[PDB]
Amino acid sequence: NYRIEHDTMGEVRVPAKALWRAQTQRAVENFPISGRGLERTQIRALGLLKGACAQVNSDLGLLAPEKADAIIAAAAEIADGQHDDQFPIDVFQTGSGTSSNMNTNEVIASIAAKGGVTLHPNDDVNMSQSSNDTFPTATHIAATEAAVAHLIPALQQLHDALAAKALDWHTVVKSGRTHLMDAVPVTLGQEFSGYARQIEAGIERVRACLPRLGELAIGGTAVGTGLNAPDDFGVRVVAVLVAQTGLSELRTAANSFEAQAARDGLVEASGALRTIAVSLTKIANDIRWMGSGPLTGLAEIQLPDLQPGCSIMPGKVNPVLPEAVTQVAAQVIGNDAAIAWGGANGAFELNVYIPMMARNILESFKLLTNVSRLFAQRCIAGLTANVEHLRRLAESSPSIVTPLNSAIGYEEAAAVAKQALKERKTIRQTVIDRGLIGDRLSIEDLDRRLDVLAMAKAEQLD
Amino acid sequence: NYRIEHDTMGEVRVPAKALWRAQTQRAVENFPISGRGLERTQIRALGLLKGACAQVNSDLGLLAPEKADAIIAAAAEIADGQHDDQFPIDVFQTGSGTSSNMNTNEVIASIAAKGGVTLHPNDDVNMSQSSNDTFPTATHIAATEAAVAHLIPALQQLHDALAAKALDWHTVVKSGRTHLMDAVPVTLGQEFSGYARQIEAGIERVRACLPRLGELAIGGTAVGTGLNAPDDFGVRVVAVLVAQTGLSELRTAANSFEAQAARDGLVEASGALRTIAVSLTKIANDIRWMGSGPLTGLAEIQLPDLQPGCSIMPGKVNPVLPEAVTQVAAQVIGNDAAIAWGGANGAFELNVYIPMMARNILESFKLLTNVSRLFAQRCIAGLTANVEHLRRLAESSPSIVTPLNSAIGYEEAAAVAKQALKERKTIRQTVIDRGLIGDRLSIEDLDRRLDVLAMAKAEQ
Amino acid sequence: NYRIEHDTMGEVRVPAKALWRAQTQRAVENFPISGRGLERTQIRALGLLKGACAQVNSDLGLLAPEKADAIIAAAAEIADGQHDDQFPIDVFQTGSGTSSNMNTNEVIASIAAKGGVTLHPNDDVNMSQSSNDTFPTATHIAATEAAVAHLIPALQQLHDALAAKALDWHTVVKSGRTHLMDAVPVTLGQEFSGYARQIEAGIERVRACLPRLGELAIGGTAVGTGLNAPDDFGVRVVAVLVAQTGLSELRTAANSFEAQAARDGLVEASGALRTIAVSLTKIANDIRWMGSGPLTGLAEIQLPDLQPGCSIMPGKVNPVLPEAVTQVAAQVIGNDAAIAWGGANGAFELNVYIPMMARNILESFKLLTNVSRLFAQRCIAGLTANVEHLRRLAESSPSIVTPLNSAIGYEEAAAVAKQALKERKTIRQTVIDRGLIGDRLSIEDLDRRLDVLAMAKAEQ
Amino acid sequence: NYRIEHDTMGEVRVPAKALWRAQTQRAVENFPISGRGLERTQIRALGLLKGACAQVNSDLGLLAPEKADAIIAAAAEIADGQHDDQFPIDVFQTGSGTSSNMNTNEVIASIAAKGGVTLHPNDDVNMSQSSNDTFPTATHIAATEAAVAHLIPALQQLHDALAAKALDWHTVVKSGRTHLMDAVPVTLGQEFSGYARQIEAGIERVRACLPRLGELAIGGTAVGTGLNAPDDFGVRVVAVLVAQTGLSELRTAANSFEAQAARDGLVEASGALRTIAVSLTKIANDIRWMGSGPLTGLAEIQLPDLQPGCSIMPGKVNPVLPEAVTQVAAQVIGNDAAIAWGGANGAFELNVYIPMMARNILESFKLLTNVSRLFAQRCIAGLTANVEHLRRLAESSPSIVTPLNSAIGYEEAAAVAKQALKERKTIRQTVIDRGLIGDRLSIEDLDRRLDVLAMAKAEQ
């Protein structure tokens, strides 16, 4: 069963029970590309914004209070998620998001009609607005909320898990590795202090993008001039959004033309997510290499077992959380390339890559948030160190000859490391055998300099 | 509400009506990352492959016919999308696809149990297999099927629509543009013949990757050695798959270690899709620039109206199909970067980025297929040329002085073009008014050489 | 002619006159890959750092004043560029930059020898150091200097040129374009204020990355533990670098392990350069589209003529500066992908992609700096507006019906716009012809609403 | 000292001794961006093409033999490398390469003038040509030559070195690793057979792009219509280029508009180079991990020592060739992103990103060629295997319980692997201790199944 709806292009047959109308139905037929529509977070931001716009139009005496109350009530239902099934339009729609904007207007008009209030989707629900300021506004609201309320707390949780290991393993000595080769001693805690700093720097990177990510185009309307909107429409709508979201990062854009002709704030934010993906790849790769083997690998640490590793090789348990992290990082890198591509190709008064840029940035925020919490809770928290094996590794490195450089010189330390590795003998034995004990180096000096934990120079903790 | 299942790690509470068992349930709790599981096409390939493996194990007398028949029947139901709700594992799972492989084994065991047959998910359903050869095999089957049966016909449809316009507009003269500036004449048909060749070359690029995209790891098992499988398991399974799908491009990998340690065939195929995204961006951008305005743009052609353009500016109609094409192309570029990143980071006997690489390559195939057909049907087929305006544009270009180079020289031809633009005069009148008619250039020569359609040199 | 030099691996034949020694010569034979060595800016940072390290070793009484004075004098010669021909090692060397570190140590030892001072390249010139902290320190010094002293002033110059045009063309009305289609009026000044803000935001993005770009690994030595260096070596060297360069952004890293195991500050900085490339592409594309034609394009503005446009089409002048800008932006995007790839692939205590990451980030800084100044001086400064053509474009847009929405409604405004375009009539006459003048709209109100400059709502 | 030269824009002061003239000098002032001009290979292809064009113009009686002979002689000097110092224009010039085309025309006219032959750079040296067909033609000649004559032989050399190790180490048993964890046995030779296949597939990928990489735009002139050129100019010039280079891969483009409006063949070729970078990353990473330690790593193989590893840690030797390979791969990925970005942004009759695309594709060919030969000669050829350590690693893997699956079942095999790892006992003794010897498994069958070399199933 179908019903007739109309727009300025003509009559359109719409499924009888759908709350959307003519323009949403045309967009359903024009863009069957990915088979996926807007996400819960996107629909929420659109509903929140539509309600705020109706409230301001009402306050300024431009829209009758009964009509504004119907929009506010319908928009609140949309924001809470009661009508996500009424947003069937593909992500790969017209680049301004006109179709999803009209989707919100039409669904509100249908909800209001069930309450006995007649609203025109353009004249009433879209009063003082354009898709060109509302769709990037709803995108930037969703991106700002994803950064502040979800990603930053998830990264803080991962940072705290890494920092707790850095403290726990502060004096657990092991051999450092540079170029994958035997280096001088480090502690496991020192390496984890490095990982924790990468995540802390990741939080700093997200926070540094917020002054421009939180800029909203609302009030600029069609081309940024604010035509058909009151001069204070933008600041009044943002006032409501800040009060209702608690997001102090939300503000009217510094320049109304830049805020619509470009989506540079999304490209900037993706760069921060991409740097986090780069940091997470290093952390996850080191952790699975430390857990490698056990018998054929490094066997430095034990990762918590999360599931049987293999359908054919029995007993084997795999580093599945570092694998999910490195695959998420690859996705964030890909999404980042798509966002920049869209960002660069605006023309004149409008960048028409917004639905695609919105899909990718919001997905990158989601993946990084979810995988960071799982990595912290299901992997980092439960790691255990193989203390004895790590100590043996530290002591086996021929590079432990290095602190003798000031006493015997680099060339003689290299002759010591050579005469030892070839004869499968210790650095200590070789130093004595080459008659190096004397004025330049006593026996007490040698054993003090060769102590692997002292060689790691771990900071003294109170 | 829940039932107990177990694996070698212990007991797991599973939803009472779920057809999956212990290992799928662990994966549900370990990877809640994207909130999306395998696509219909991926589940089909896994079901298809599981059935083919049971058939070969049965043919070789390794699996009792009653057990093999139960796997074949259950796997066919999975392949035919009767149990997609029984595959809840995230894309961002363990990099070998072990979890989705065990998901298929467990769901087949549960289906077989309803038919009165007891199957062990490892010993029976996974006999002669590993996730390490089965999951990349199912990925390469799905990718090969997407290329041959869906993308190539969609690109052929777009090519034919572009070639139809090249023929219809063969003598529709217009001004060429280089660097966005006034150039010599072209026909609108010649431009469309360029677009048609880009799509034809795109088909050639997809076809050229098929010998390596169609390579399957099946038979290599855990590390590529084929341990716990018959020596001819791979060749026998590939023969069953080819007959069951009609997909002749499927083949056993040339090297069983390369086929599991790497996913280079996916990286190669993504490069072809990325080149198609690059070609489509040029075609879609030119088409929306040709349709620009009408009054403030180039207004060369009219795109079919597909929907009201704007919620605030009434009457305005936008080039929505070229916008869908250029956004899809951006996504394919991004997906391509993710595929290469995963492809480079294999280690020793296994590349563990397969679920992520599979997601991206299959999505790129889907988006390009669907948008190419929509672009051909809802945009290219219905384009109309503004023949009058195009003619005025061709004749207005000062670069139409170019065929006079052999008669008056480049330097004098430049002086003519500058003066004609400055005095808002024709090239013809500027040539005469500069006193250039004489022994080197007769008036008949001038009139002959300035004909814009003849200047486009359209093939007879 | 050659001479014999030695290292712990053995004898090496070195060109007789070369100031480098055995380890540089081995690196010349091991890495003939790109055929390009370190840039002037990289050799300066290495020379500056080596001198600062010798000064601190001297201040702490670890190095004899005669030896320290010889290193300081030789390092100052390297810093000034007298010896760039003594750095022949390829960019694509060992990933820590060990070879270029030993190149600096060996060349300083050879220069000091000419002055009668014997220095061991390891024991003296490299005292308290590693390549693992010095090579990323010299990279981060060069990158910080490129950002603060060169790119930010170049972007400020471009911003000021764009802002000057935004002011000069504040009331130069034209038609806005959305989706490349006829939109409501804007001023050329308003568009240029948008471009100005993109560059201003670009400066903010570079400034926001400086707290982490300026972090130096110096003092961490081999693995970040500071082994074989005094405990205050890093803080003393940084203070000397700050006093000598005036770059207050140079600071000791917050974590000595993160500062060597990763190059995340370079990845972060590249992201800011990549965003600037994205902004510059939009600005340059709009400018060449505004200058397009003239007769077959938009012909909105005139770009200064910089060179003859075409070897075959006489008279034609091309937008060469916007083309230089968009090609630089493409390079910065590519360099950005190479930097991130290297950045992700560190292992344990060291990221061994530093020479490649250094090449790409420093090149992106250089290209953006040089093309931004050329774009501001040779293109933006000299632009002229075609004021009458721009006014006719604003008045011709059917979307000028938009401010009537509140009086006649969106649906009627769409019927007005469509009828106006069909009958090739003005919006004003179509409103009167449809009998819309009455209680909801007076002729006085209509004429006020249709004024294109008033419609652009330019700020007072 | 300077001299005056002129073009259609006016008079230009040119350095007295420079062989270039007015347009090259304007380009020197307009584009000081990267500070690097065209490469030796690019200037060679431009010289070769200019000579071939003069020969064809002479053959068709369009150019006086004295003038054609002077161009052919001068173009041969340019192609030979005698005048690379006469090409000062930056890579980041006008996107068509107009400046470098005029650079070639002007330098040829100056060389010819020394023998008393007057040639007009446009009317004579550029007869029947445009920069729009010659600059992409010279780019595609250089790219085709780099692929056929340099990269493919370098990859063949690497393939042969990898295949030689696959043969030598055919029965050198080791433990396989999947997910970096203990897997079933493989041989070192089997892994090298996987590496050899990745390079062999890389050669196949380069060969598959040659039908489109070798397509030349020559003859299409300004916009692809062939205006001001003979109808067979393209086919005649290509015939000369094939005879002089011996490159049968050089062909006239299938469509003259596609060949100039787009550079899709460069994007396609870069995708093959990018796949090779992906393959090389896996191979180089496995090799440095196998050579890791020795005492704190895997210590599976020994890489040849090429230089002292470290300025601070004495004795240490690093895997510098795998590091140069992985950094080259990162650069090829970055260059690939820049090529695709330029490729997608053509407009109408011309893609104006050619100098940037040319720089990146030719650099990717060069880096891959040079690093592949160095990797084969200085690393792969000299590798040695630690045979006894490798066999002990194979025997130590608990996953050697895997071939018992058919006898005791997966669940019981897991119980064996658990007990053995927990009690530090062998798989063999755990099987006996669990009382599994009986009807399903004899002691003789157990010992045959646990033989690690037999478990690797190396081909006879």
Ligand SMILES: O=C(O)/C=C/C(=O)O
């Ligand atoms: O949908 C709108 O509000 C705007 C559309 C346009 O600029 O075309």
Ligand SMILES: O=C(O)/C=C/C(=O)O
């Ligand atoms: O699930 C499998 O078949 C393989 C797993 C592994 O290699 O760990």
Ligand SMILES: O=C(O)/C=C/C(=O)O
């Ligand atoms: O330099 C040429 O041959 C062409 C130039 C143009 O198309 O502008």
Ligand SMILES: O=C(O)/C=C/C(=O)O
């Ligand atoms: O050259 C150095 O100082 C360090 C080298 C290494 O870690 O191998």
Ligand SMILES: [Ca+2]
């Ligand atoms: Ca707050």
Ligand SMILES: [Ca+2]
């Ligand atoms: Ca039964």
Ligand SMILES: [Ca+2]
């Ligand atoms: Ca041949």
